[PDB]
Amino acid sequence: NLLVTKRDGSTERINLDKIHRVLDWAAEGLHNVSISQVELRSHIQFYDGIKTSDIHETIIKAAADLISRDAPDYQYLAARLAIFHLRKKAYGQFEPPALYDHVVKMVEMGKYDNHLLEDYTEEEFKQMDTFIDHDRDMTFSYAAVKQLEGKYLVQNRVTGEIYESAQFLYILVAACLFSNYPRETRLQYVKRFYDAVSTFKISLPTPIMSGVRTPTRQFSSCVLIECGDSLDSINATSSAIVKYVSQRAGIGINAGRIRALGSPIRGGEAFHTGCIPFYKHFQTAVKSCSQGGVRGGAATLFYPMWHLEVESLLVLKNNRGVEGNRVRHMDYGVQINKLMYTRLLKGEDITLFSPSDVPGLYDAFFADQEEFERLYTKYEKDDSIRKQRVKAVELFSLMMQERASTGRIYIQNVDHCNTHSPFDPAIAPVRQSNLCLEIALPTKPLNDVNDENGEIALCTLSAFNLGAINNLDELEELAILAVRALDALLDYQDYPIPAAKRGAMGRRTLGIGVINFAYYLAKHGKRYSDGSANNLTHKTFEAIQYYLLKASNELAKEQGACPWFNETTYAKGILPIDTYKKDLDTIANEPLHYDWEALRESIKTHGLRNSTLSALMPSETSSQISNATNGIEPPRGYVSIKASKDGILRQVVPDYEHLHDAYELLWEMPGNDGYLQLVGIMQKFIDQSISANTNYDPSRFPSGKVPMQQLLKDLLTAYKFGVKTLYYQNTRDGA
């Protein structure tokens, strides 16, 4: 006869039928899906004592491989086949156990934190069980599902055991994040939030979903640190980075302070060794947790473009060069300002100085654009001062090259990140941005690894799905649901370094990111390149921002008001709707729609629970969990492809059925101009910096060589519309 080994353990004879019925359960309510297809696709090789689990495993990958553009449903087909396996591999049976029962069981197993069993009585638990819709597990697109089977779900990494379920996960987080809340609104918010996230209406950072409800108390994602030219300072930075990379966090180092090579030390008793020696160390620290240095530990370093070693620095990400002259494991962000670009357009030179050979030259760069301009020329025409002249047209050129050569050298216009920042340039000047490039928060160096003064920008963020809200108004609820819930994490997550805790509790900066922007612009006909979305964008982002400030301002009554709020310009009555670059009105004529003055005063009177609520960050996993489009950048193709642990993943762009025409794929774009114009608009409302990336296609350029002209031209375009930063330059590879 024939044999089989049921996951239960017992034996059975092969039942060719039982398979079919399974595929059916999936093909149920689907088209273009051939039940017979997946079978033959899978070449399932039978052999005695084969486990039923493995058998089931085979079809999952097979169905996932048939997820073609012509077969959009297959994406959901395999998804159903997947959800099944998971639930049964963690519950013994297809239907998960009651909220209460489960919560408790996993507690004593070390997996769920008993913290919940104490803040919620059985009744409240069994009640919340009502809100839970296990059936929502059948609303996942396999793309997202596969991710859940790793990062999000609670599981045993050695043994493989999966202890948890897809709505089960959702609800727990909602409550465990609202536990310390009033008896009367607490059950309520627990549901209104659960649905907001369970319905993919509001996606949250990967780190969050996994650990809310487990032992670990840390939600930190991206951090910033400014290093001091002083020997001792660096040593601390070295330690901090390791402490933070040890908890898998992205790093944002600012060594623009290390005093230049040759600079005096102690008078004339010893001359400085340079910035590079300090920079490379920074890299070993971020990799302190990485195997082979291949992956893990992300460090982005920032520095002034007028630095005396600017030329030295550009080379390092390049692979063509001597080891000791290249730090290639980390990204770099060139800092630029208004005078800088000026020199380029005038074919004039750029005097390079050392942060330590000039007084007021640095600080001015970040906060005041006049002083840096007045001071600059002074030393520029001064000979006492170690200097080095280099034609601007000669510098910007080099920089831009490495940017397209690697696609890691970003850009950051300081003046815009200070004249259009919720913070005051004098009081809390922003000197740097994070690995993601989307965070504009104030920074301070640390004398010690645990300096009291030190400030370590800590950013916590959540995202709003534009493809999940029918009208702009719906945001106002989701706004409070996010801002409130988020602000709570700040008091639930422990801070490794003290300089962070203080700097965190102090302003409670909140980063809110929007996703599925591609689907949105398409659902309205508009596109990126024609810019017909310029107005649609202005009106949209105008709202998203308004409601967030109103949600925060409102909380500025319910749980105090911000510790440092005074520093920010918001308290000074300054609004982000009157700081944007005037150049923008020229690409958007969509006047504001929601009374702003109402908040202009309501926030003068009461304050804000946070210092920042608007930022744009590109997220790999938040986007696919909702089957939405990555951040704002349009998809490179209708049939999204990726390698999971299995190595085949397919994600059809939201609604390919009527949406094929309206989608303007990243490569379908004529030029980068269109993209920028929309970005500059978003900035007019973003407290913090959008992760806008530029994309070029050599295949479209005469002699197949992207012209320097175009590259430089674009940079000016961004600066002209008040764009804060630049992100990956990805060229048209695969040819």
Add this chain to the structure above:
Amino acid sequence: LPFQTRSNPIPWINTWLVSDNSEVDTDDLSNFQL
């Protein structure tokens, strides 16, 4: 037409019925007004 409309349950069958065997200038820059 009497039988209900459908999508070929088997597409794998088709296999057998098909045909069986850097530029830099200050020129263009000078003009931009950031």
